[PDB]
Amino acid sequence: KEEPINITPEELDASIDRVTEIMIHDIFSPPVASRIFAYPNVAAYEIVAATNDNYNSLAGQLNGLTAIPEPDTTKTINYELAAVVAHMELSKRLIFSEDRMESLRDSLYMVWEGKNPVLFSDSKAYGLQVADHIGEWMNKDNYAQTRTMPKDPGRWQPTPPAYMDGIEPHWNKIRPFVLDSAAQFKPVPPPAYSLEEDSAFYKELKEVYDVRNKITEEGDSSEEIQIARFWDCNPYVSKKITPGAHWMGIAKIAARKTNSDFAKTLFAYTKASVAMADAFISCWDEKYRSNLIRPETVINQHIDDSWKPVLQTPPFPEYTSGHSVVSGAASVVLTEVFGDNFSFDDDTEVPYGLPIRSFKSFKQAADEAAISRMYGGIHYRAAIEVGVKQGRDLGTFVVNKLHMLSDKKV
């Protein structure tokens, strides 16, 4: 009983799709979701790097990460199999409903164990050894400690309908993967809160107000409303994926469209997920520095008590926009991996109630994701424009810092 086990990139995708689904169920927030995607990819990628002379190890490149154990030269191991095992095991550790990862895992294990028990056993064992190593490092990143950390008129207020307390005030205290510090990409400050009619703040408030009213005047056909809903990606609305998950989905689309092999797929997902996790830290750092009031609050208190945004306002401060920062970063990474002018059909939102939208490039998609927040009535211009810059600057740094691809024969 010694058939080969063919591991394909679609099995990695299976793990990431299941964790995605579980995240929705367990009600993970946008920044916490980015941490769930990153660590399991790093573990799998390290397995690949240790065994493929075209890819360099991230040990020594990511903060605190040391070399993984090498595989036993006396055993025949299928390294892709080990990489999938590592990915699933860490993914399971990072969500609450572990039984839902275990079901996916056990169903793969049963076929593998059935075809080649010895290869399966040796390969699983190595995958689990690596997951333990990577688990030790992930458990030193300050997430556990921040779980029980204690909790002008421009200050952010919780917003209706739910008036939830701000999400993840201390996300800036998580260990970044690549950044030298959480604040490395701190942006310029937002315009000073002001109700003076000639002020920069008031101009931007008036823009939010006016855009929403133009959308009203066009009616519910309007393309703006479709764009706002496509990118909304807010699990607190009173079944949706977060923005990091959506970009993980675009990374998958690109990898499948290019017929990228297991190693190239993992490379891409790892570079993207690491960048996004650092993008959330950078963006949340600024959110809780500037702690800026959301547009509906100022509009309903000072301008028009009947006005409502197209989208529900997320429960966290305004500046800079998460969508803008994370899309900026992700766009830069995918452009670097798969190229500019990469056209694609984005079907990531089809299982979540939406149609397909087509794009001519990752840059174009990011630009749409950023302006969707203006159509949505929940961000001012500065949070969007400055946020895209912040994410593109951060994603540039990540791509310039991480040396992963390194062809054996050049």
Cα separation, 251 vs 13, in Å, equals: 10
By C-beta, is 48 or 298 nearer to Na ion?
48
Residue 301 tokens read as 């208190």
By C-beta, is 246 or 271 nearer to Na ion?
271
By C-beta, is 43 or 174 nearer to Na ion?
43
- Least Å from the CB of residue 48 to Na ion: 8
Burial of 17 (C-beta count, 10 Å sphere; 0-12/13-18/19+): middle
Angle at the Cα of 185 from the Cα atoms of 281 and 365, rounded to 5 degrees: 75
Q: Do 37 and 383 form a contact (C-beta atoms < 8 A)?
A: no
Which secondary structure element, helix H or strand E, spans residue 346, and what is its range?
A: strand 344-346
Q: Do 84 and 11 form a contact (C-beta atoms < 8 A)?
A: yes
Is 394 a residue that touches Na ion (CB under 5 A)? Answer: no
Is 386 a residue that touches Na ion (CB under 5 A)? Answer: no
Total of chain residues touching Na ion, rule CB under 5 A: 2
Cα separation, 43 vs 58, in Å, equals: 10
By C-beta, is 245 or 404 nearer to Na ion?
404
Which residue minimizes CB distance to Na ion? 49
Is 58 a residue that touches Na ion (CB under 5 A)? Answer: no
Residue 358 backbone phi and psi in degrees, to 5: -105, 150
Is 266 a residue that touches Na ion (CB under 5 A)? Answer: no
Is 49 a residue that touches Na ion (CB under 5 A)? Answer: yes
Binding region for Na ion (CB under 5 A) out of 41-49, 149-157, 229-237, 329-337: 41-49
Binding region for Na ion (CB under 5 A) out of 48-56, 171-179, 181-189, 220-228: 48-56
- Least Å from the CB of residue 142 to Na ion: 29
- Least Å from the CB of residue 363 to Na ion: 31
By C-beta, is 1 or 408 nearer to Na ion?
408
Is 68 a residue that touches Na ion (CB under 5 A)? Answer: no
- Least Å from the CB of residue 265 to Na ion: 16
Binding region for Na ion (CB under 5 A) out of 52-60, 119-127, 328-336, 389-397: 52-60
Burial of 183 (C-beta count, 10 Å sphere; 0-12/13-18/19+): middle
Provide the sign of the torsion angle of the four alpha carbons 225, 231, 235, 240, taken in this order: positive
Does 320 sit behind a cis peptide bond, omega within 30 degrees of 0 on the bond before it? yes
By C-beta, is 49 or 94 nearer to Na ion?
49
Binding region for Na ion (CB under 5 A) out of 47-55, 107-115, 186-194, 317-325: 47-55
Binding region for Na ion (CB under 5 A) out of 43-51, 271-279, 283-291, 333-341: 43-51
- C-beta atoms surrounding 117 within 10 Å: 12
Binding region for Na ion (CB under 5 A) out of 5-13, 44-52, 325-333, 396-404: 44-52
Q: What is the dihedral of CA 387, 388, 391, 396, to 10 degrees?
A: -140
- Least Å from the CB of residue 112 to Na ion: 25
Provide the sign of the torsion angle of the four alpha carbons 101, 103, 108, 110, taken in this order: positive
- Least Å from the CB of residue 406 to Na ion: 8
Cα separation, 45 vs 80, in Å, equals: 10
By C-beta, is 55 or 338 nearer to Na ion?
55
Cα separation, 37 vs 324, in Å, equals: 19
- Least Å from the CB of residue 91 to Na ion: 23
Binding region for Na ion (CB under 5 A) out of 54-62, 102-110, 182-190, 359-367: 54-62
| Residue-level length of the chain | 410
- Least Å from the CB of residue 54 to Na ion: 7
By C-beta, is 55 or 375 nearer to Na ion?
55
- Least Å from the CB of residue 50 to Na ion: 6
- Least Å from the CB of residue 401 to Na ion: 18
By C-beta, is 54 or 142 nearer to Na ion?
54
Those residues with Cβ within 8 angstroms of residue 233's Cβ, 6 or more apart along the chain or in another chain: 30, 240, 241, 242, 243, 245, 246, 323
Residue 4 tokens read as 């080969």
Residue 347 tokens read as 């079907």
Query: What are the residues facing 390 on neighbouring strands?
Result: none
By C-beta, is 134 or 227 nearer to Na ion?
134
Can you give the binding site for Na ion, defined by CB under 5 A?
49, 55
